[PDB]
Design a protein around this ligand. Structure first.
Ligand code: N9W
Ligand code: K
Ligand code: K
Ligand code: ZN
Length: 634
């Protein structure tokens, strides 16, 4: 199974620039590339990436997306002087040409193709191409919006042709609409395009009626084009995450792509003079992480825009950090999306409900704090199997049954206070405390898994010891039907429970998911995970995640374990009751950052969707990130 992240970059793509006065275009500068690579170098990220050389896209490759007439016209620009270059530029909208830009456009496109080959040949897990010029506005026969050739559209056509892929997801999180990509694939159900973009009721460039939520694709492609217009500026982390939980991810996990390509424009970040949005660079760590379980992690990130040199470097590092598997930053202050965003979300969900049934509803001078440091743990995952069980661990895991004397005193302290004598339980309690101490009190260990015999005693000591680490908030995720010694009456704990017996939920610090039996159970769980569990978990913002499985589904445990590591900087402790060799290896693999096997194809039972929406109604006034409609004003 592949490992590593590719980083594709060449200084040659910084060797063209605007040659005449034009305040509109003067933000597209060589320094965008130099600042981003240097930021990656400064933070040690470029050094941990496999450098793959750029190459030129061939004529044949360019003709996958562009016409002979347009290519021939661009091919003449290297011979043009400044007067001729300006006249050629003015044949198009919002684009400038330079003696070297045709060369650089072939490099930008070839760089993308190199990234596609590195990932699809399993030479790396994923990667990023830092390229100029950007691509997503260019069209079959036109340059547009600083773009000459459509790098990302190339990548998907090339992956289709050379790897016979049937399903490709393109995520365009640039702040502008990538109309060139939309047009390229609008009739094509094999490529799913998602774009959010500043729109402001069509008053924002490119001013197109077909950038609205009502453009769903054409013909056999209907439903495979998803536009989310932002009709106000100032969108925040919460708006962006609401878009992912309630629009992009539900569709993406049902689509089940074989490759993911990101049109990664960071002009959607705070401080950008084009986007004027308010999302922090740290949000791109989570946008990346939330897509990484798709396609067994095969993700090709391609730079589009981003014009605030500072938010640019920081957002590039946060993305590469997540591609490398480094722990995600905690996102504080999350809540409801704003009314305009909720309107956009509700509108796209409604027009798309004919194609993704999951969307059906039943009738009625800028500054921000510098991002903290993200550092992979010395050893990522600690595993404590039952005594005398030696297993083959991934290279970033480790055993740890070695209870210290400090720990041993604490276990007796606890034993004599609250409980009796089973020296096996008492050893596991020493393991829980030692693992928790390494997880919280050091950057030495990220997360862990402990196999456990007596649940009630083990949960109590894990939870109670976690609180005094200190862990100000603890998310508990429990697969089982019991009642745990967990109190949710002070706001320090949120309890997620997936069980078989329907049990009424009172207060708003608990989410109980009772899903019916059958082959429908897998999709229902995923829909609950993306639509309920993650919105609450993210708003709750825990400092530790505590997973609990009773010996008495679980085709999704790897997906939950991966996605839930977006919380608490990836600090998750899982207690498995009883030894199950496969569930233990699955848990360890997801905790350790390995790729997740895709889920493939059966839609959820209407009783399950009713139960989940009943839970959203019950919880969304407390937890506003659950909302996917505008609230009714009294
Ligand atoms: C300011 N409005 C929005 C942008 C714009 C407009 C415009 C008008 C004339 C020339 C260039 C222009 N530009 C330049 C422009 C800036 C950024 C991007 C971009 O990042 N696309 O992903 C693409 C184009 C209109
Ligand atoms: K976009
Ligand atoms: K499409
Ligand atoms: Zn842009």
């Amino acid at each position: 199974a592949a490992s590593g992240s590719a980083l594709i970059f060449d200084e040659e793509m910084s060797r063209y620039k605007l040659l005449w006065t034009d305040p509109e275009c003067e933000i597209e500068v060589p320094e965008r590339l130099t600042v981003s690579y240097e930021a990656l170098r400064t933070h040690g990220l470029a050094q941990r990436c496999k450098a793959v050389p750029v190459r030129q896209a061939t004529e044949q490759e360019i003709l996958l997306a562009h016409s002979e007439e347009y290519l021939e016209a661009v091919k003449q620009t290297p011979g043009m002087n400044v007067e001729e270059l300006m006249a050629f530029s003015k044949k198009y909208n919002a684009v400038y040409f330079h003696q070297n830009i045709y060369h650089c456009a072939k490099l930008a496109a070839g760089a993308t193709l190199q990234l596609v080959d590195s990932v699809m040949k399993r030479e790396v897990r994923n990667g990023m191409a830092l390229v100029r010029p950007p691509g997503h506005h260019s069209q079959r026969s036109a340059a547009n919006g600083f773009c000459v050739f459509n790098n990302v559209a190339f990548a998907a056509l090339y992956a289709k042709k050379n790897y016979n892929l049937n399903r490709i997801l393109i995520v365009d999180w640039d702040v502008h609409h990538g109309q060139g990509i939309q047009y390229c694939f609008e009739e094509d159900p094999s490529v799913l395009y998602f774009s959010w973009h500043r729109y402001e009721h069509q008053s924002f460039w490119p001013n197109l009626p077909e950038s609205d939520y009502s453009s769903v694709g054409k013909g056999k492609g209907s439903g495979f084009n998803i536009n989310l217009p932002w009709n106000k500026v100032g969108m925040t982390n919460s708006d962006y995450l609401a878009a992912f939980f309630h629009v992009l991810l539900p569709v993406a996990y049902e689509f089940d792509p074989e490759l993911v390509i990101v049109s990664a424009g960071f002009d959607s970040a705070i401080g950008d003079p084009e986007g004027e949005m308010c999302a922090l660079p740290e949000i791109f760590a989570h946008l990346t992480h939330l897509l990484m379980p798709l396609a067994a992690g095969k993700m090709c990130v391609v730079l589009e825009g981003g014009y605030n040199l500072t938010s640019l470097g920081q957002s590039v590092c946060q993305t590469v950090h997540s591609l490398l598997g480094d722990p995600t930053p905690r996102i504080s202050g999350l809540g409801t999306a704003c009314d305009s965003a909720l309107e956009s979300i509700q509108n796209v969900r409604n027009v798309q409900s004919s194609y993704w049934s999951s969307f059906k509803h039943l009738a009625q001078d800028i500054v921000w704090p510098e991002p903290l440091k993200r550092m992979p743990a010395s050893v990522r995952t600690v595993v404590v199997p039952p005594p005398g069980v030696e297993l083959t661990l991934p290279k970033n895991c480790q055993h740890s049954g070695d209870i210290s004397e400090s720990t041993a005193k604490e276990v007796q302290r606890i034993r004599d206070k609250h409980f009796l004598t089973d020296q096996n339980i008492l050893r596991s309690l020493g393991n829980i405390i030692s693992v928790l101490d390494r997880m919280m009190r050091s950057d030495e260990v990220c997360n862990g898994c402990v196999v456990v015999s007596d649940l009630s005693v083990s949960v109590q000591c894990a939870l109670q010891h976690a609180l005094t680490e200190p862990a100000e908030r603890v998310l508990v995720v429990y697969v089982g039907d019991g009642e745990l010694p967990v109190k949710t009456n002070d706001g320090k704990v949120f309890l997620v429970q997936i069980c078989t017996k329907e049990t009424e939920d009172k207060c708003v610090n608990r989410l109980t998911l009772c899903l019916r039996e059958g082959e429908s159970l897998t999709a229902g769980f995923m829909q609950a995970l993306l639509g309920l569990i993650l919105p609450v978990a993210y708003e709750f913002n825990p400092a530790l995640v505590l997973g609990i499985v009773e010996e008495t589904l679980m085709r999704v445990w790897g997906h939950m374990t991966c996605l839930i590591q977006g919380l608490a900087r990836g600090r998750m402790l899982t207690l498995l009751q009883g030894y199950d060799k496969d569930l233990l290896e699955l848990t360890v693999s997801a905790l350790s950052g390995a790729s997740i096997s895709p889920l493939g194809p059966r839609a959820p039972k209407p009783e399950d969707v009713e139960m989940m929406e009943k839970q959203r109604q019950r919880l969304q006034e407390r937890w506003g990130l659950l909302r996917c409609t505008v609230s009714e004003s009294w």
